[PDB]
Amino acid sequence: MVPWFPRKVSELDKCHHLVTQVYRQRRKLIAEIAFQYRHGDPIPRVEYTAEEIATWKEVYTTLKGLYATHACGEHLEAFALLERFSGYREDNIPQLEDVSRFLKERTGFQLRPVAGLLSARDFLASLAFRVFQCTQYIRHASSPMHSPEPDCCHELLGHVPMLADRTFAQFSQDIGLASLGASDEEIEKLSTLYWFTVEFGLCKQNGEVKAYGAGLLSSYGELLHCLSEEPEIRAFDPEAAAVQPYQDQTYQSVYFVSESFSDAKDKLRSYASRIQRPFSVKFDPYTLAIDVLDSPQAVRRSLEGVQDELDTLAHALSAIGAENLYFQ
């Protein structure tokens, strides 16, 4: 018994294992778009109903007011560009194709439509390729301020802005890379680490505590609660966070705060280094493949690329002069 993991981005077509009258028919229709999708395809567009846009507007408006005071700098910066380039506005639900093109140009992240909640292994495996499995459906109009399902609103307002940051995109990918071929017990630990970071994480920004977690930036009640005096805020430690018990019904009683994203990424790399695996993995951004470093010769193959990059930088330093250049 040894677990298979994708080694090519197209192999994510095999990583579709899901955790489980008018509204139900619409939900069947949007799920069919996701089931038909194959890597490489343009993400199909959804013509959202007036009720669906009204549901978006309520969520969007309420949370936007809270962002200035509670959201971290990286989320606010990206949210601004998304309002400028990806069609983020109160009267319009953004299209995944527009958002995927934005992320691709910024960090190399791309979106994939998904029918629903993926198994932890397949979700983390996708992140190894800088692919975010996104839902296109929207929650019921009866309960807009609460949703137990990651609906479109959750994804676009909570998960996407942070993926536009180079450091956070590397962190998200690093969790994904660590999961490849890991045991179910370590997938539970990485899924828990993801929960107290990507989902409900907090960060220190110029002596102030801000929210960066998708579950917080997509929930009005939890965004207020996380920065209030009610919860127990602890320093970010990957080992402490991975073994921390949690629930998904009420607000989180414990939140983990990181010094910076760069430091959290360094902490995660140390945690990932003490994961029981007889090999390591390296992402090939050219082919969007996983290189399994399972021998000294596999390491030398990858080292050749790093050596060429250093040659580029050495030549750059020799080319740099005191003269101020004029580019057309």
Add this chain to the structure above:
Amino acid sequence: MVPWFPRKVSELDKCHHLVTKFDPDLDLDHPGFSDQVYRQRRKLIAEIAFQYRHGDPIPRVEYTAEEIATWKEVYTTLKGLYATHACGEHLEAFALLERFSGYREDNIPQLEDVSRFLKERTGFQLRPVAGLLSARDFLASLAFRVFQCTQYIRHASSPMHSPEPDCCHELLGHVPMLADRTFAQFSQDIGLASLGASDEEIEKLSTLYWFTVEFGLCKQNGEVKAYGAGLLSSYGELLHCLSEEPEIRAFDPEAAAVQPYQDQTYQSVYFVSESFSDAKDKLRSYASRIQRPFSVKFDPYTLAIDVLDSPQAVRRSLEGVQDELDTLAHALSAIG
């Protein structure tokens, strides 16, 4: 003033300046000149290319029975010559395109299928182009690992000879070599060296490209094999290049860049490289002595060009290299 160059893969939409040579409208010696059907088809396929914008799926062309018969003639004749004259990297890739990209005598392959193949193998991708691009725009595209590819086919009257780069030339000559990691890096390296260079330097790099990517030879286990696109796509020249008629010289980037040439008859002089790895190392040394007050680095994540023109620009690129080395250090502890 440094000339404008693309810094994002989408900016290749602005790099569409075409060369006007052996044109079916202008040249009365063109085989298709008096063929109104051929000329109409050529107008149609060019319009597909002009409409194309980065991000679009590459349009499919339904080729006529006459067009498939032309493909079949070229494909069959050249395939027979490949076992004895083609280099190992071409033969290996050709066999993989046959089985995964629809390369077969009774079918012209589609650029979308080929682009997906090349992407998975070396990160190269295709873009439809109306015809031959100016040296600057063609080399600028290579800098993003983009190959500007035609979809039209040569007139049915002259199948064994075509001075224009039709889909037979592109698919049989250029594409199999782009499936090799080392050759794909060599081709991107010529492209990166061209970005914002003088016209004089572009002419030198175009001339270097001609003796490597178009008409290059390589030493494979003491034997001389062909790797150039102009040779692997021409029955006549593929035979000529390995005969005792032409003058074969050792590959030197400075010698090749200043060597005069013509595109009418077969090449009289060819340059042979020890290996592709060595040719790339020679190229690095040539590119290092190019007059440029900055350098460039490809970002394969966003398919962008990072202009390294300051110490802060160099640190930002060094950060990535530092993270890659951290990965490799953890790998060595995992193998331990």
Add this chain to the structure above:
Amino acid sequence: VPWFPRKVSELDKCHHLVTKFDPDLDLDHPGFSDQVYRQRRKLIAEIAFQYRHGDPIPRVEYTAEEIATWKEVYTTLKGLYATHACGEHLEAFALLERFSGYREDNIPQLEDVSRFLKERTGFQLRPVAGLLSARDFLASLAFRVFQCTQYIRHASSPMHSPEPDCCHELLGHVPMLADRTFAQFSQDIGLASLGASDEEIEKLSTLYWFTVEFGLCKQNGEVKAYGAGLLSSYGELLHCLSEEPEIRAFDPEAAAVQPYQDQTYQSVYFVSESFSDAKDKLRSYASRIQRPFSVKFDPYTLAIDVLDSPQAVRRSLEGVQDELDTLAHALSAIGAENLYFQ
């Protein structure tokens, strides 16, 4: 920019001393009224003044009184080490006992000790007349040079000495400098000081005091002593691990601005998670030091390379590129087969 040495031989110019504790200037010194002790101090100081980089360190023939003082200091502290000293100290102490002549009836010679440290971490000693000014002391550490005294504390007060006598240097400083990580940390404080303002040297000197001099470390959940002043003082070694002092987490910015005294024991101590982590913390502190250049040590020529231009950085990058070529060959040469070396 203040003058700083750029060649190890230029440490011959970094000999500015702090005299406030000397047996001839301080009234409260145990040797003050001892004309014999003061004469001997003058003699051993002359050995240090005559010394020029490259010279073998001259040997001192210690008197029976001086060996008796060593014996008292050595014996008492050796008993406390097993329970209070950090692992790196204990490991090195055992090796110095067996290779550098560390025993109760013999004062070790600096030449023997310098050869030991050279082979272990590249650190070397040079005889110094007394306590050097913060700038000169730190400047020497940048070259992996430890300015070491050869004199010994007065025989009347063997359990306390406010000056860095040979007991302090050999029992306190030397064992920790046999560790590659700690040697790197010591050199890193040294490199950070080169051409820094007097205000920044005062901060770096105070950082040194609460690390190399009176620093504590977490070793498998327990708190151990690594500070030279702790490991060479029986009283201070007991006190630092007792319930009396205030132990704080190591933070370079907090430690550098923390006030202190040199009369009684330290009321506040700083504890580091590991030496590797303390070095990383120091690297961050040193990065936010006001300097219009950076420095890199050349271990081949024992020189300081001032990285003040992109051309300077690419010259240093060439070396790193050659080192990576070495590692790439090794990975291609390595096999699964278990080698037999004669």
Add this chain to the structure above:
Amino acid sequence: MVPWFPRKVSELDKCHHLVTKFDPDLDLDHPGFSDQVYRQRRKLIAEIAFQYRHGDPIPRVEYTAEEIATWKEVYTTLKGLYATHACGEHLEAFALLERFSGYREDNIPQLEDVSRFLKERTGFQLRPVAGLLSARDFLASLAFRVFQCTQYIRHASSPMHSPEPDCCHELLGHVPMLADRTFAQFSQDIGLASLGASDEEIEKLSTLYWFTVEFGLCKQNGEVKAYGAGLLSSYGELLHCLSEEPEIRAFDPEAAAVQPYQDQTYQSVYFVSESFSDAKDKLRSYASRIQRPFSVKFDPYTLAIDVLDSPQAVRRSLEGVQDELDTLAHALSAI
């Protein structure tokens, strides 16, 4: 079994195996054979070298007036030829030794002074040696940036020719080039390649050394100059190497390593390198295809050899490189 090789600079005390070639006791064709005074002096200077143990100060030799007169003849004659025939790196270093290491016609320089000069310049240092060391021990020494150096001087009867490596040969031929950073790296690289290699490989690297360090030529601004120690220490061969008589070939490590040679007359074939930087890159490629199930990395702090024979050994060394890159990244942000 991997042959024993030193892993610490002190272990060079065990790398003292000498060759017996043109010996004043055994060879009756030696100029000093019938000279009992010369033979006694040679015995004396060899005893200084035999007493030497790593860590010792390099002993000084009080040279006789006859010995200084022999030095003067060799020094003067060659110095006149250097301006036109020597490479830039030798000329630059020669001028610095004249001013700092006591290089002058009326004085034989002391190895203690020369070693201190080289240490400050490229990290190279010297050791006194009784005579010519076996190829394995000599190449092993180079791996630690140690040059094993003789202190004796050729017989006064034959000053313009000496088939043995005396002080004139070492100091005039070998030392100035070791003051160049690139050339010092090239010499160490040949030495590191040899550690624990087969005898067949030692013979190849020994021949490579002959066509580079001993009799190499280099292209300097379109001109061919001499950098080889056997050339820069011989008036006759320094003239010959740049004349139209010899066959000059492009430097190729594989071609040079298998090229046959003799030590009686002047070399008929010479190898010319584009630059020292390029020759080092060529040598790296050659060394990469040497049959050794491990590699070796010098630790300049402890002057030790780290045997990279496992992934753990490689990540240990990679840690240092990673720290160096951190330094350089901060430097770029500071400017």
